[PDB]
Design a protein around this ligand. Structure first.
Ligand SMILES: CC(C)(COP(=O)(O)OP(=O)(O)OC[C@H]1O[C@@H](n2cnc3c(N)ncnc32)[C@H](O)[C@@H]1OP(=O)(O)O)[C@@H](O)C(=O)NCCC(=O)NCCSC(=O)CC(=O)O
Ligand SMILES: CC(C)(COP(=O)(O)OP(=O)(O)OC[C@H]1O[C@@H](n2cnc3c(N)ncnc32)[C@H](O)[C@@H]1OP(=O)(O)O)[C@@H](O)C(=O)NCCC(=O)NCCSC(=O)CC(=O)O
Ligand SMILES: CC(C)(COP(=O)(O)OP(=O)(O)OC[C@H]1O[C@@H](n2cnc3c(N)ncnc32)[C@H](O)[C@@H]1OP(=O)(O)O)[C@@H](O)C(=O)NCCC(=O)NCCSC(=O)CC(=O)O
Ligand SMILES: CC(C)(COP(=O)(O)OP(=O)(O)OC[C@H]1O[C@@H](n2cnc3c(N)ncnc32)[C@H](O)[C@@H]1OP(=O)(O)O)[C@@H](O)C(=O)NCCC(=O)NCCSC(=O)CC(=O)O
Ligand SMILES: CC(C)(COP(=O)(O)OP(=O)(O)OC[C@H]1O[C@@H](n2cnc3c(N)ncnc32)[C@H](O)[C@@H]1OP(=O)(O)O)[C@@H](O)C(=O)NCCC(=O)NCCSC(=O)CC(=O)O
Ligand SMILES: CC(C)(COP(=O)(O)OP(=O)(O)OC[C@H]1O[C@@H](n2cnc3c(N)ncnc32)[C@H](O)[C@@H]1OP(=O)(O)O)[C@@H](O)C(=O)NCCC(=O)NCCSC(=O)CC(=O)O
Ligand SMILES: CC(C)(COP(=O)(O)OP(=O)(O)OC[C@H]1O[C@@H](n2cnc3c(N)ncnc32)[C@H](O)[C@@H]1OP(=O)(O)O)[C@@H](O)C(=O)NCCC(=O)NCCSC(=O)CC(=O)O
Ligand SMILES: CC(C)(COP(=O)(O)OP(=O)(O)OC[C@H]1O[C@@H](n2cnc3c(N)ncnc32)[C@H](O)[C@@H]1OP(=O)(O)O)[C@@H](O)C(=O)NCCC(=O)NCCSC(=O)CC(=O)O
Lengths: 164, 163, 161, 164, 162, 162, 162, 162
């Protein structure tokens, strides 16, 4: 029924409603990324410097995008994207990415970086990510986790068009 | 009439100021029909952006919106405009001249901008060139990219008074 | 006896203070042509950190280093194990703990100048003379040193847990 | 008489003695660098990001080196350099350069960069400066003030030598 | 070049801290039979002070000492001059500055334990093997050292020492 | 199990208070010819401290002591390890920790009045019947229990004890 | 008669102050050849305390004393019971209560200068002319009157005195 | 008009400062073998006090002294009466006033060093060469003077000295 989008995180205080949403997001990420260790997912989701765009359907977490903004560096690292299995192929992934794009325009961070594996690179291509990295290697080598084996990809946002 | 220059911006600490940015957003938007109004308003009212307001008789008639990147050593030129009935009188040059002198006093000596085919001439007349000495590694991801426009650069001489 | 590893630096505690002195002692005694005052300046410099190796409350070796996150590498400044405790794998455990620490912090490159007395130790830790970090990335950040050989180690990234 | 070296500047929080020394230094820089507009020297010498090493003899400023530390880039820019004409060719300029080196040794900065006229290049050569610039252009362009026409020069410090 | 004397100690700024390291280095190198860790613990102990001898910004000697005002004496803990600066009067100059310092703080007795290689230096600074301070006043306060000689210096507060 | 050491005493929270009660029971049970009220008074006395030995949250032994920093020594008052944890080195690790703690406070002499069942243990810890501390520094600060042997341990501050 | 024991001293309450006047009166009447001004100075001295014997609200005797914790003893300054209440055990109960009170303050030695009229009473309270406290601990702290006998009492912290 | 005031530089108004300078002047002129900078340091020391003798607002004499209440005695530091007020009993009145002062502060011993030119003044004030205060209580607290004679005065607290 009712769909909500919210950008949340564990600030250095957390609504009980927020704390349960964060557990829900860790649950979803963990289940949809089974070889990603759950303790690692938990630490990023609950890290103050990370934020997560929660997708709420009838008060229940059904998807998210966890990310770390690097405003000093001019980009944001996408850490986890996931929709729960029985809600996939319904466009939720696309509305999530769009909402994330809207959120970043309004904070003048205009570049996404992410590692895309073989299971989801096709989704990132359809959201405009390419393998041509325009951000200088020196801007991100020390900041994003290197998921060697997976393909580094980049999205450039246009701050002049509406995404939501 | 009387002509005054003032550097203003949306602080985090006025009404004469606020009304002037509204006017500048108005003029910027009318002279730049391809820049969406909301995008102009978002940048013009962003606190890290400043605008060199040109004013004739209490009325905003021109401005240069800009964004100082002092950690990077350059200022980004964001918007330039002179209201239509006041063009070809030298206001565009006095605004650039004033923006130059102001940047000498804050020891920022490089301007970067993107120019479409219709504005490249104006910037060339203000001393901008297509040859970019500032490295990509310093500006990409900090200045707004504009694919399909030409990146232009101006170098300032601090031993020279511009105004 | 008991073995501890601790990454420490000047802010601190009295415990950390006396460890930094022990490290400055170990570095200075094993590198006697370094000026004593220069080692102390770096060990107590707050953008340097030192990995300390402790045996029964005692400094018996360490590695002092400078991280450059904006450049994706870390400079290794001093490595020393006290004489009585050398040739026991302690140098290897130090470098292994240093490697783990840097993988957790997303820095996958070590740069260091090695001399003729210790280049082989660095070789056995996977360092080589082939420098893949661009010169434009480390020039002016690491203390260049004519008469010594710049070496590089590349680490493999790892997902924690 | 008595000689004193002091690293001084217009900082966050002023001293009456420091202020007058700063006026004195701006006077000496202007009188010895005529091509530099006196008002340009003034705003640099009083800029908080700039420091000046003052050479004091008998309470009176007779020389100085104005410099801008760029620690995130690894070098220091030497901005002005002057000894009052009455005190030149007595080794004061060397002593000044030596103290500035020692000061930078203790602050773990080991490169100097400066633009020198044909008139002054000899003095910097004798302080160990070289036309061979080993810092990449990407590291200093837009940070040091360009003087097109003058020669860019670099001095490398050894943190193991006692310069004072 | 420029000689300077400073009484310092832990309690804390970078210059003092690097000086304390410098004193620890000089003590430890000139007293090889003293554990480096022990020297470091006492030099950096807040009830311990050190009179540091500064030549052109570098530490070239000092005297680490422990004032016992309730007991009426100071314990000399370490004295050293760096090898290349010795036999130039620096050791005598350090002790004189230490005596002058203690006059103004109204402590007029020094106590130290000297091994056979150090007795001569203390004798020439006016120390004696005749101990006037009673055992009940110093035992358990100063660190005793079996095998070394306890020596004592009495100061004249009516005399300019420096 | 998990073994901890805590220096505690009265001045306050309940875990400490139950530890102090356990110490009182252990001391009292191991030393039954000593009035229980007297042990309790001393353990809860604010000028007294106890080094507690904890095994799985429970008190299995300790050393109750009285620091006299003005007199330059500490008095060992009670030493006890519970009966089933004896002859395993806990009594020695307790004394060792107590030694390390006193070196940090520049108290280098322990004194104790040992009975005939305890002298062997104190000798193993380096105590001796040769008292170097003069009578005038300890008489009346510690009670001379008739028939008990005065014993002294001197601590070496250059050495690690734990 | 309702008997009470209170340890009191100056530096305030109305009842305490009238008790102190009453103690100055009893001490002075029972010791007529000691100047009443000197008794008052001591009784009201803030470093002096008095253990007061109270019968039906009225002061009928007491012991004025000076605790010297730094020196590890207490000086007995005056003892008196009013004449109508002598030879009924009051002086013994006072001294017993004084002993208990010093036991819980870790002071185990009393020193006093008895005159010829009071040596018998002090002997019955366990005082001896054999002084174990060394002279250096008490001389100049307690007042030595020519013609008085220094006597000493050693307390046992394991004995219940009251 | 004669006046007696106990004064000191206790961490002083203008009147007290000029009296202290007056006393430094008088002591300096009457004890010319004391360095005038030494007299100044002691007279102005916050732990020292001086009993001033004032005549028509003017300083004509005094006794500078240092109270050691921890040690149970006081050190007589300087004694002087200006030359044209001498042999009038002013110096006796001063010592008596100082005695009265010390009884009300429960200090009963004076210690001082006297050369031959001064021993007879102190003998007339009740000082003896037989020292009862033990060496462990004064050595390193009072200022030694080799070649002078250590003298002692025992005061009696039941005697009004003024
Ligand atoms: C990838 C998803 C989050 C996408 O969410 P949705 O299923 O709601 O997608 P959507 O409905 O909005 O579809 C948008 C378009 O992408 C296409 N598409 C192509 N490949 C796809 C793929 N592998 N997964 C999902 N969609 C894919 C769809 O056909 C559709 O095409 P069209 O519109 O033309 O019809 C989900 O599949 C998921 O949770 N997967 C498991 C988790 C995962 O792999 N996450 C990324 C890991 S890599 C990474 O960076 C780590 C991380 O983020 O977790
Ligand atoms: C460009 C202007 C700001 C210049 O204003 P003025 O007319 O007051 O300037 P001026 O009178 O000093 O003209 C100086 C000289 O410039 C020369 N000239 C040549 N080409 C020109 C050009 N395209 N625009 C303006 N002047 C131009 C003219 O010959 C003129 O006369 P002579 O040569 O004889 O001396 C204005 O014309 C204007 O508002 N234009 C529309 C808005 C715009 O295009 N802004 C720039 C892009 S925004 C931007 O900054 C980048 C971005 O956001 O992407
Ligand atoms: C270099 C050391 C820290 C190494 O410590 P250890 O002795 O504990 O090494 P280790 O026991 O773990 O030995 C691991 C492997 O290295 C091999 N090996 C080869 N050459 C070696 C050499 N020159 N020194 C030490 N080990 C060496 C050993 O045979 C062994 O091989 P295998 O196990 O396969 O049989 C120590 O030797 C030392 O403190 N030396 C003096 C200080 C010094 O020279 N420092 C480096 C300065 S240059 C520099 O870059 C700055 C700095 O580091 O200070
Ligand atoms: C350059 C000076 C600061 C040097 O000071 P001193 O006169 O005290 O020099 P000194 O006594 O220490 O001697 C240094 C040695 O260098 C040699 N030498 C060679 N060329 C020289 C030159 N142009 N000026 C001074 N010395 C020079 C001299 O022979 C000398 O002796 P020997 O040969 O025997 O060893 C001063 O001369 C001066 O203030 N000049 C005017 C201002 C100026 O030009 N400043 C520098 C430019 S500032 C600049 O352009 C860079 C910047 O902007 O920061
Ligand atoms: C002893 C020193 C501090 C003295 O320093 P200096 O050499 O500068 O002294 P100086 O130049 O003033 O010498 C003054 C005179 O003393 C005489 N002299 C006698 N013995 C001497 C000795 N062992 N070393 C130096 N001088 C000595 C010399 O004849 C000399 O010349 P003349 O007679 O002609 O005038 C130094 O030599 C040193 O650092 N030694 C190693 C450390 C040490 O032994 N420290 C003392 C123990 S530490 C301590 O305090 C106790 C403890 O650790 O328990
Ligand atoms: C005394 C103890 C605290 C010792 O504790 P531990 O049993 O844990 O001792 P440990 O295992 O660490 O050390 C054992 C070593 O000491 C030697 N040893 C010799 N005589 C001993 C003796 N009477 N008790 C214990 N050990 C003794 C053993 O041969 C052995 O030799 P090796 O060297 O080969 O290993 C305990 O036995 C105990 O609680 N006893 C009853 C209480 C008591 O008597 N306390 C002291 C009272 S007098 C006092 O001043 C304190 C007090 O009042 O309680
Ligand atoms: C000394 C006193 C405080 C004792 O007080 P009490 O009268 O209450 O004594 P008490 O009843 O408890 O007696 C305890 C035992 O001490 C024995 N005894 C021996 N000589 C005594 C003596 N000189 N004075 C009092 N009792 C004395 C008695 O026989 C007595 O009985 P038995 O032996 O049978 O049990 C008091 O007598 C008094 O105030 N005296 C005047 C002041 C004085 O002298 N103060 C001390 C000065 S220095
Ligand atoms: C000593 C004085 C303070 C005494 O003062 P007055 O003159 O007022 O003495 P007075 O009138 O009260 O008593 C005089 C009586 O003392 C006797 N008498 C014996 N020897 C004397 C002596 N050496 N000095 C003064 N009086 C002396 C006389 O016979 C006379 O006898 P009769 O009794 O029958 O009347 C003064 O003389 C003085 O200022 N002297 C110079 C300073 C000085 O020497 N101060 C003492 C040392 S300072 C110190 O404290 C020592 C140190 O620190 O080393």
């Amino acid at each position: 029924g009712i769909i909500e989008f919210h950008v949340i995180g564990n600030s250095l205080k957390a609504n009980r409603r927020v704390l349960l949403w964060l557990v829900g997001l860790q649950n979803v990420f963990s289940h949809q990324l089974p070889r990603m260790p759950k303790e690692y997912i938990a630490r990023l989701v609950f890290d103050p410097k990370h934020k997560t765009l929660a997708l709420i359907k009838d008060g229940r977490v059904i998807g998210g995008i966890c990310f770390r903004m690097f405003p000093t560096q001019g980009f944001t690292e996408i850490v986890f994207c996931a929709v729960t299995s029985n809600e996939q192929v319904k466009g939720y992934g696309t509305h999530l990415m769009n909402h994330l794009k809207e959120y970043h325009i309004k904070h003048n961070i205009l570049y996404f970086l992410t590692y895309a594996d073989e299971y989801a690179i096709g989704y990132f291509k359809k959201q405009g990510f390419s393998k041509d990295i325009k951000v200088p290697k020196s801007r991100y080598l020390g900041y994003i986790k290197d998921y060697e084996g997976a393909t580094l990809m980049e999205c450039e946002l246009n701050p002049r068009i509406p995404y939501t």
